[PDB]
């Protein structure tokens, strides 16, 4: 001994029962009476399906009745212990995991029976063999058929999700509720990135998301009155300033590069500064800060100027709470949580794994790297058709709208996206 | 007490000493390991060196082997080697005290995974869905088998060879390779592998499609990479010739839409069951398809792809599930199996156990992912 | 202590003499008196030895006058210990085994007493040590320049087997004692393919070993009224079928193999099918099957139907008893006690191991994948001069019969082998 | 007791620490391991690790190392340290007492092998030819040399490299060979090494016939790939230009039949001991080769090839089974030395100890496997 | 404990300067009193360091005195102590090594003093932290910067030194006081190879350092009445009298290799050979000789005929005194104590690392492979200008005299150095 169980856990799964009758339902999916190490769990689920069943309200009322009329109320320890079950739930609505731990622990004495009575059996019946080995086969997968699984969605409820979709792609009107972009396609489909949204932008080298992200940027400081904050961890502050120079005032940016100024790209350099320096955009290029540190820093900038939007040149590169797979899932967790905080879009660039070569990238892309998938309540791939300079921005996840391709084309001579 | 036969292995030594050609049969049907007791384990194995140096094996150079090996007395000495060439009256019936050792032998065996899986059970809590595919594979690996014993006539291969040449399955939508298949047989495992970009996924959907639209059968597909709404919105945009960058891209011309609204209707008659769970096991694979048979039908089981489920369990794995159900199964696979296909595009067929062994050719869409005939 | 040392094998020795006399000689040819660890066997042989010197019959009686005059026997046991020696060989032919056991315990007992001597004389003379280091090696060297080697073959004795060789091909006459193959020149050496025989055909990939055994098999079971057992554990029984369809009815295989076929190429495909149909022939196409499988099989097909040959699609696919040098050497053998079992030629085919590259393929190339050399009683290699389409089948053994070459053409459109 | 001279390592140490320059000469002749006693040992090593840095070595700076390596208290303390320093009169005589402690050092060491080889020969049993080969390296293995003391003068060399330009060993049968060689002297171990097909075995054949059926040496062949009956069949086929394919496929000419009782004739008279044993080891040919000698004569010994027989040990085995027979020895390999000679072929030689070094020409017929002269 | 230390160090020290007043500079550069673990010590040290300061002589008595004075005599242990110091120093002129070994044990002391007291800190003041981090970084880097460095050579003093080379490059006139090498502008340099000296010529490989060597070896031997021994440990004493040979009678050295002599080529080598056999040349060819070996067979070959030069071809072939960093030192050191012994110029060539090619050799490139440079009196390099056949031979190191570049001509056909 002993046997694989969780009293904690079953004694959560009826408390959530007592606290919200809709409970049941997930709990009666994922476990049948049987399930439960206690006798006294298995009298109570019992009663509570039966209650159920007659399209009665499961609730220690009825359930204390069922268990009185089946002789069995003393016997589970009474009124006084229902109660109990009601005081042992940390949350109703965190039922599904709690019958999930029930369901594996009987799943674990259904292995260990089993395979304790194939031994038994190796023993005994000496006798044929033949039979012991087929039969031996047949119980050990007959034990993996019971966790509840399923199901499979049917084509026709999908399409009537993508035909809902198609309906907001073109029901597109109108109204920007939040920080415009200054892409008013990209505005359409989201309206455009809103306040505690965690927006993140992936994209393979070379394709552009930082070029993106700082046109957005740009766009954001220059044209609203927002301050939006950069944090560039694998670019330095005058080397994005660079950028952005060239992308406002149109300046050819390989011929910055090299010195070569015609006398009026020169002109047309001061105009650049003169409009980009009222803009209120706040740089922090410290190679690889911790979130703890960016939170701080956006904390203080909010109250001290106010804050509209805060961009990540890209997240991979974020250090850790210490000193890889966990450690970019608290911190996808902790940039949600910042959003929430500042009630402010985050845009954390992204980069792709090497699997858009061995297929149009989608979601399974940074499922490699996630769990940012989650995290995120809006994810955009940036992906170029022939890798014609235009570039198209996939959102693959919006959690208040839908789900589409928009347009743009890419400039390379000044780093700039523009509009279609 | 461990199942054994001291008698059975005591004979079967006893006979190899009374007649050297009695270890060929011998050594044919155990191992060493097989002899529940060491001393016999022992001398069996000084038994079975000997004859590969290739020496005549009797009681002296045996007992030099032992001894040479320093296990003479651990074994019983010349004494014990002695009692077994003496009391055995005969080596005719060497093989079945062999079979009766063997079969000893595979009852620990058994004994022993299940006690192993027993006691996993409870210091591995923590694993349940590892636990329970090595459990399976572990008890598998258990039995071997054996090939029962039926030699195939010339006569009954001839026939098929002949049939094998000049459609009693399951329809494909693809006429030419309907010939080479006739079409999707029941309980095969199909494999179709490929390079990036050909695509593996479009062709996958294609005759997943070409099957749901077209036959009353229901078809259950596990895509692993990408969602269940970009699958389908694959599948319309080929069912209607139905450019992709029009969907995507929102704005959509009157000949999208009542093309459209023909390939959602053509559509949702299907026959068509989806799961887009990210690491999906095998066996989460048989449950769901199982309860599906059982209250629906099917079926075909078309799987994108395998790599995302060591290979060779897997695939074994499916199999089963194959034979299980009574339905063909399609795993594609990127670059134990019943017909393997490898990817203007042509089709190479490498392996079927039925069926011709040859090339097809079909066309390929690159706007509306979708193949077709020639 | 204790000195290596095989009482066992010393008294299974000096048995053997008392039961066969010409034990003598090999005994004496690998021992001296003085490699006996026992006096008592020292006295035995050297009064063995003695009587033979004089030409005298070596047994039971006139050792023991010789010992009695020479006052030794009481000393040895007398008589009766005679008599236990007798009881102690399990077989007189395996005397020449005893005896080596004999020998290498007193090489050994040499190496420990010289190593000790050595050791001692670094304590003692200390002194001179040039000379000791000298002597040390002088004295180690001698301990192995005393086992029995030799002898070398004489070139003369080898040209009389050379020209005795020659002699039975030449002497080629002409009966076909065994199971004719089809190919008259290969017949002649063979006579053909005899009842018992293990027959191995060794041969590189891409050479035509498989083409070879399906074109004896097919002439077997189609020109007698033989029946063919045939094992493929790489290629399966259609995949084989269509093979001999085509070498049948002279179909060009890579035709089939595209469908494409000519009205009448398939007016050839109808008569090959039909006169391949009344063959016995016997496929099992299991990947990888244990030899008591394969004896099994072939066990109850010659008492149901009747057995005149087994073939094998190459030996070294053949899995072991258990789950790769010694497990061959096993399935070796086994084969050799199928052929005497069911009385029937067993064909083998083996591959060859990458030396013939190195270098026309001989002994040693299968000498590494051995001890196959042993069991075989004819050992046959396939080699193509070219890599004219003709190919040589070099008879390497042959237990009753010549060692030579015979010559065949291959067609590679039909996958055949014709005669010449 | 094990060999030792306490008071000649004592004197070394000490005339170190009198005259730190008595560290050169002691270097030379011991290493810290030869001393006995860890305690000198230890204040060897300590010396030599000061001298590397390169810092003066004295009591202070000695000291001062062993303290830091943790140890000064082990030897005996800077105590002992002084007394060794105190009691050495002179450190003229350092090389005579550091040989002493050498001396002894060889002694242990040749203790310690064969009480190692005295204990492996009741424990490895088993073993046997394992066990007689590396007894031989064992104790090889003990004793360095030293190149006793004899500088060449230049007159001496000069007339070895005249004569060295413009036939005195065992005749080849190839006259321009002969003319590199002169022929093939005895006690010499010749290597000829080559690739695939050329070939090295047809060489070594044709060198073995020329020298038995021309003089009246014996050969001792030892071929470990091809029998001795494939061998004699290369042989007379080459002898009398026979047709190999002629031999092999029965159907002879009548001028293959007295071009063949020719050649057997021609070769019943050499001259030629084989030995086809598959896997041989260095001893069992000098067994075997002492053993013809001492009953018949020879000699010239032919071996093909050497890696069929950790290759450096068998190398120089071989150089003293040539100079044990005081006869030529040629082993062939595939691609210490007396001779070493690379293979219309080129023989090109890269290393004679008293001969020239250049290149020779020779013919090579496929048909009879045989090489002629130009 | 106990505090690193060394006792017998400072007693070596402070008994160092009253045997040499002198040795208290090379102290008090290293030292200061408190870095003396023992109080006695640093009062002792003090007291001479006051003694110093005033210009007054210190020994025995005036440190006697001053101690008095200062009331610390008797505290120390008295003037019977002081004698006691004098006794206890192996050598004065060792003075630094024993003052480092005392400066490395204070050093340490300081180590531990600071880092425990890190430690406590951390324990105690909890409180601030970051100050506490910083005060940790800073105390932790003021223990190493302690230590007695520099000075820095200032570049006037090495103008000076630079002068004075050239000085005595154009001053170089002109007798020959050691061994003349026949290349008169090396003679010029070196005057020529010394006795005792030990002379170490480097090169790359395909450079021509053998030729070189044997060059010198051949005009010693010829042309003066002086006995060469060259050990030729990659090369056979026949292969090396070939390329000398040449060298000598003119000689094309590719003819000879491949048997080709014009007739009157052939009257070349006769004269060659003539005047060759009339020279000291003798050869060892042993492939990989000790340095014993070596000693031995020069030491009996002075006495036995007299001895001018050694050559040993290239020292990293030269095993060492067992069965290669600390080796190749000691034979280094062995090479120059086997030049002092027989009063004779010793070259032995040395191979060069691949330094060269990762930049025209300087001394760093046999420093990966020393300390050949200390042992070394000359060092010498070659060095080809065009990997024109003329080639360089930089003199590196000469205790004696200039080093600059000397320069000769390569004759590849005879395999030859000439004048130029």
Chains 1, 3, 5 share one sequence.
Not at 260 to 269: A, I
Not at 291 to 319: F, H, P, T
Not at 325 to 341: G, T
Request: a negative charge; proline letters at 3%.
């Amino acid at each position: 001994r002993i046997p694989p169980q969780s009293i904690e856990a079953e004694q959560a799964v009826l408390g959530a029962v007592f606290l919200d009758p809709a409970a049941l339902v997930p709990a009666s999916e994922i476990l049948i009476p049987e399930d439960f190490y206690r006798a006294a769990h298995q009298k109570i689920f019992h009663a509570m399906l039966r209650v159920a069943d007659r399209g009665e309200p499961v609730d220690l009322v009825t359930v204390t009745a069922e268990l009185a009329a089946s002789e069995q109320l003393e016997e589970i320890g009474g009124v006084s212990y229902l109660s109990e079950l009601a005081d042992a739930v940390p949350t109703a609505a965190n039922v599904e995991y709690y019958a999930r731990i029930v369901e594996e622990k009987s799943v674990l004495r259904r292995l260990i029976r089993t395979a304790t009575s194939i031994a038994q059996d190796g023993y005994t019946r000496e006798d044929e063999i033949d039979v012991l080995l087929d039969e031996a086969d047949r119980k050990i997968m007959e034990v993996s058929q019971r966790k509840h699984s399923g199901a499979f969605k049917n084509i026709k409820d999908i399409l009537v999700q993508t035909y809902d979709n198609i309906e907001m792609l073109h029901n597109r009107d109108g109204e920007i509720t939040g920080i415009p972009t200054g892409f008013t396609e990209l505005d359409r489909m989201t309206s455009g990135f809103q306040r505690s949204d965690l927006i993140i932008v992936a994209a393979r080298p070379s394709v552009g998301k930082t070029a993106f992200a700082l046109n957005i940027a740009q766009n954001v400081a220059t044209k609203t009155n927002e301050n939006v904050a950069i944090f560039s961890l694998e670019m330095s502050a005058q080397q994005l300033v660079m950028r952005m120079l060239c992308a406002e005032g149109n300046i050819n940016a390989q011929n910055l590069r090299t010195g070569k100024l015609t006398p009026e790209d020169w002109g047309k350099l001061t105009m650049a500064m003169g409009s980009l320096s009222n803009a209120g955009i706040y740089i922090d290029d410290t190679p690889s800060i911790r979130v703890s540190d960016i939170r701080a820093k956006c904390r203080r900038l909010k109250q001290e100027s106010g804050l509209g939007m805060i961009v990540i040149d890209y997240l991979q590169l974020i250090q850790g709470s210490g000193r890889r797979q966990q450690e970019v899932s608290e911190i996808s967790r902790s940039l949600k949580a910042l959003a929430r905080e500042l009630e402010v879009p985050v845009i954390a660039l992204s980069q792709l794994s090497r699997s858009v070569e061995q297929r149009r990238p989608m979601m399974s892309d940074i499922r490699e790297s996630g769990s940012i998938e989650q995290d995120a309540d809006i994810v955009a791939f940036l992906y170029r058709d022939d890798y014609k300079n235009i570039i198209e921005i996939i959102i693959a996840k919006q959690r208040n709208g839908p789900v589409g391709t928009v347009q743009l084309a890419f400039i390379k001579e000044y780093n700039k996206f523009v509009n279609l």
